[PDB]
Amino acid sequence: MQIFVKTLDGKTITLEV
């Protein structure tokens, strides 16, 4: 399973299990 998350500060990283 693949699920993406983004922040208003300036960061990009994938959430995987």
Side-chain angles (χ1 to χ4, degrees):
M1 48 270 262
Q2 270 158 271
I3 42 119
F4 265 82
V5 280
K6 222 168 156 167
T7 45
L8 273 119
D9 265 90
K11 276 174 194 194
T12 43
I13 41 123
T14 46
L15 226 121
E16 272 200 90
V17 281

